[PDB]
Amino acid sequence: MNIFEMLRIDHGLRLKIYKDTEGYYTIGIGHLLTKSPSLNAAKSELDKAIGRNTNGVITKDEAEKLFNQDVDAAVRGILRNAKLKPVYDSLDAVRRAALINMVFQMGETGVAGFTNSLRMLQQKRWDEAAVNLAKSRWYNQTPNRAKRVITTFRTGTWDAYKNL
Ligand SMILES: [Cl-]
Ligand SMILES: [Cl-]
């Protein structure tokens, strides 16, 4: 299992614009287009992202291209973030994938805000961080996804993803 497979499970693959769980226009594998309520705005962002007049539909290859760029961006945001970097640097390979997941999902900024859990993760207090992570809007809004990631941090294994 790896980050790509992991996030592909968490986000699915959609070839036409759709609204995510927060009501925002997205496409591909979790690629947020815009927070704005305008389908046009969304369409404009997509064409600009793809480099062609798409008409709100993309190919699988195109979706994957955005997916690679996005994963890459998440890794670099972490590495560039003064609050994130040290946490990431202290984790094993599986847990690093759990940190990338959250960043992909809610941005560096959102993640850097879980100050307390970050501290626990850094200290390797797994069960305690797991409990703390759960006390969040994130967990309450998308509990199933949140549980997979949280279990990943608790255990340091891919068990939550095997079966999916
Ligand atoms: Cl883009
Ligand atoms: Cl969920």
d(CA 100, CA 95): 9
How many angstroms separate the alpha carbon of residue 42 from the centre of ligand 1?
12
CATH number at residue 135: 1.10.530.40
What is 6-45 written as a DSSP string?
HHHHHH--EEEEEE-TTS-EEEETTEEEESSS-HHHHHHH
Strands laid side by side in the 25-28 sheet? 14-19, 25-28, 31-34
Residue 32 tokens, joined: 């947020």
How many angstroms separate the alpha carbon of residue 117 from the centre of ligand 2?
20
Q: How many domains does the chain have?
A: 1
What resolution (Å)? 1.9
How many angstroms separate the alpha carbon of residue 138 from the centre of ligand 1?
24
Distances (CA, A) of 46 to 106, 119, 120: 20, 37, 39
How many angstroms separate the alpha carbon of residue 146 from the centre of ligand 2?
7
Q: Obtained via which technique?
A: X-ray
Domain that holds residue 55: 1-164
How many angstroms separate the alpha carbon of residue 54 from the centre of ligand 2?
29
Burial class (CB in 10 A: 0-12, 13-18, 19+), 160: buried
